[PDB]
């Protein structure tokens, strides 16, 4: 049982950041890379290989 007890102590000792910073980072990444996805933005039929 000591093997299980060791892991619980091991996983506890990690630094964490607030939810605000993580949400801001996710939003920033999504807004930055938003102009480079064919699914969201319908590209012209010239560049579409499936038409």
């Amino acid at each position: 049982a000591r093997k299980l007890v060791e892991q619980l102590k091991m996983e506890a000792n990690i630094d964490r950041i607030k939810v605000s910073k993580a949400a801001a980072d996710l939003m920033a990444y999504c807004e930055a890379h938003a102009k480079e996805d064919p699914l969201l933005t319908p590209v012209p039929a010239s560049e579409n290989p499936f038409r």
Binding site: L8, S20, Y29, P38
Partner: protein, 329 residues
């Protein structure tokens, strides 16, 4: 041995104190993406029976699917014509994979064996054995090392050159149903049948963190393109978005009109759209940030079991039990 409860309470208090504001609160004011309409572009036929798995190639041109008739077929999406057809020793397959180098194809099923084929020579190359249960998923980490997860609550990292396990990952209680690799191929996760998702380290070989948001078995899992988040799907018709750094979930995607299970989850290239397949014979397109539906991909007569998005993110392919594959754009 009552210290275990003390550590769990310590974890709970730290997680509660970490939270400051909900994800919906921050992202409320952004404009929506609106309705997204997708139409079928190609239809691939030729499988005698139902399909369980598929995996796009790294060149966004070739894909491989495995059916219960005991046959692997490599398609060509651009010209909807086959290239290869590989018979199998056993007719039960539950997974498939495509090597990053475009030279090897692996498949494993109800027999407790993972097989590897050599496309550019089509005969069997290696047979990896040692698992005590059926395999669920397998992904090519490189051209000579492969990571697999089986039904005996274990995961292993193999060596193709010698065919022997290098590191074994243990800790789960229920069966393991899926896994996915990080963008830098340094970490990987797994979703089990005990409603828990864990984060491993390939080099170290020891578990790091654990998430316990769901209430039933987990059937799918996938990383965010950023590499710091991942979303799962379960039998209670819910998809939850977790986060490594904060170490708790941020958002749940649920609706009152669905009571079915979830079989596949995938992201888009920008990460704005989350695509999931259900048992209602159709797929749904969710909004990652605002948690609002934005379209439906219907057209399959039976349940959807596979789904994948190209590396370039130009199209999405869905496979179903109706022995058909479709390409949506």
């Amino acid at each position: 041995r009552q210290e275990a409860e003390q550590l769990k309470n310590q974890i709970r208090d730290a997680r509660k104190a970490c939270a400051d504001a909900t994800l919906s609160q921050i992202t409320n004011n952004i404009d929506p993406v609106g309705r997204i309409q997708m139409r079928t572009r190609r239809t691939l036929r030729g499988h005698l029976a139902k399909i369980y798995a598929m995996h796009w190639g790294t060149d966004s041109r070739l894909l491989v699917s495995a059916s219960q008739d005991g046959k692997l077929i490599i398609w060509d999406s651009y010209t909807t014509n086959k290239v290869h057809a590989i018979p199998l020793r056993s007719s039960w397959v539950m997974t498939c994979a495509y090597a990053p180098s475009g030279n090897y194809v692996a498949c494993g099923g109800l027999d407790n064996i993972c097989s590897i084929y050599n496309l550019k020579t089509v005969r069997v190359s290696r047979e990896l054995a040692g698992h005590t249960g059926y395999l669920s998923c397998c992904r090519f980490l490189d051209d000579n090392q492969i990571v697999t997860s089986s039904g005996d609550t274990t995961c292993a990292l193999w060596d193709i050159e010698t065919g022997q396990q290098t590191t074994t990952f243990t800790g789960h209680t229920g069966d393991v149903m899926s896994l996915s690799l990080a963008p830098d191929t340094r970490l990987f996760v797994s979703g089990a049948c005990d409603a828990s998702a864990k984060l491993w380290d390939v080099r170290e070989g020891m578990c790091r963190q654990t998430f316990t948001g769901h209430e039933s078995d987990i059937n799918a899992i996938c990383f965010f393109p950023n590499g710091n988040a991942f979303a799962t799907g379960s039998d209670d018709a819910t998809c939850r978005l977790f986060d490594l750094r904060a170490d708790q979930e941020l958002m749940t995607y649920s609706h009152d009109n669905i009571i079915c299970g979830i079989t596949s989850v995938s992201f888009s290239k920008s990460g704005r759209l989350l695509l999931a397949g259900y048992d209602d014979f159709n797929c749904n397109v969710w909004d990652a940030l605002k948690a609002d539906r934005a379209g439906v991909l219907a057209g399959h007569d039976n349940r959807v079991s596979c789904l994948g998005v190209t590396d370039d993110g130009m199209a999405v392919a869905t496979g179903s039990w109706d022995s058909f594959l479709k390409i949506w754009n």
